[PDB]
Design a protein around this ligand. Sequence first.
Ligand SMILES: NC(=O)c1ccc[n+]([C@@H]2O[C@H](COP(=O)([O-])OP(=O)(O)OC[C@H]3O[C@@H](n4cnc5c(N)ncnc54)[C@H](OP(=O)(O)O)[C@@H]3O)[C@@H](O)[C@H]2O)c1
Ligand SMILES: CCCCCn1c(SCc2ccccn2)nc2cc(C(=O)N3CCCC3)ccc2c1=O
Length: 315
Amino acid sequence: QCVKLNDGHFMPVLGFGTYAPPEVPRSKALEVTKLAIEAGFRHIDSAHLYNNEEQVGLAIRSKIADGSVKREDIFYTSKLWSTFHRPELVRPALENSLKKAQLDYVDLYLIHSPMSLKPGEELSPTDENGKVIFDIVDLCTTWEAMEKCKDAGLAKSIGVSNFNRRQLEMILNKPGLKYKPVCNQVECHPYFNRSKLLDFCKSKDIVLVAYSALGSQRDKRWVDPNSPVLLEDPVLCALAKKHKRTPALIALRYQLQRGVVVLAKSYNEQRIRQNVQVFEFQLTAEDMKAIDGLDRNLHYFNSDSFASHPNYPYS
Ligand SMILES: NC(=O)c1ccc[n+]([C@@H]2O[C@H](COP(=O)([O-])OP(=O)(O)OC[C@H]3O[C@@H](n4cnc5c(N)ncnc54)[C@H](OP(=O)(O)O)[C@@H]3O)[C@@H](O)[C@H]2O)c1
Ligand SMILES: CCCCCn1c(SCc2ccccn2)nc2cc(C(=O)N3CCCC3)ccc2c1=O
């Protein structure tokens, strides 16, 4: 069901990933989020980046209006994009997300990345040669702005995404810190299992929330097509046959058993309904040891565009 966060709120441990690339019509997010809620998802992950908060928020409002759920049964996350890290831009960015979703509050607002970008409206601002333009912002000042958003009731909880241990430590040692991040949402799957980061997070009562837990959507802009496809891994597929489940269910169950909250994106009705079967079976200790053996420090988001940024979290 849910895990209790460090501020006393509750996060469902399976969440629905809503990002789809620009080639997927915008209206599909409305349909699939309704299907996710119908299947049993109660945690729904969006972002200003995803150009879908209006569609996702409509799906949530539709399922409330038809009696299927109450607003307090849904855990909705959005995120502060990287051109809005300057503290004066944080509350307006959250207000804009609330307006788009037509919601009074989000359950969770995250700093989407530590990789600050030039302030503006351009999502990935670029110069002449096409180099994205970076910004230098003290993230503890952005964090103070997030904390005021929690005080105002615009976000029930606040946290971060894509932070490494050092960047989290910077927040946690902030003079006059009011709220710790509840979570750190990061790439995490059996080829990049983040065990050192997970240990650090558990020692700080911070939840690690795994994205790209099924191996990412393998978007051309940032993904090497040579990278092994997580769900074609022979150990995952052998465990799927052993349990008569599927490689995606093995990869999601692995996270739950390590105390990681797990996201899963699918825009396919059958796979959405499949993925909630993660609560119907268990992996044994030998199974978990087999999956730990797969770790290969492979982050699918792997581009020069990210790696050249001064606050790139991987090293
Ligand atoms: N904070 C960040 O920087 C960040 C970054 C990346 C992702 N995220 C969040 O995490 C979500 C999930 O990560 P992701 O988008 O990278 O995708 P993912 O959850 O790793 O899924 C990868 C692919 O798996 C497929 N799939 C889903 N269920 C399956 C099943 N049962 N069997 C087989 N294939 C299956 C999906 O294709 P179909 O749609 O065709 O089923 C999907 O495109 C995102 O949507 C977003 O909400 C956040
Ligand atoms: C359809 C819109 C395109 C989405 C582009 N995008 C962008 S563009 C901004 C940009 C470009 C270059 C440098 C910094 N920032 N940055 C992201 C950043 C992270 C993140 O923090 N990571 C990735 C590896 C290490 C940590 C995750 C996902 C994305 C993403 O998907």
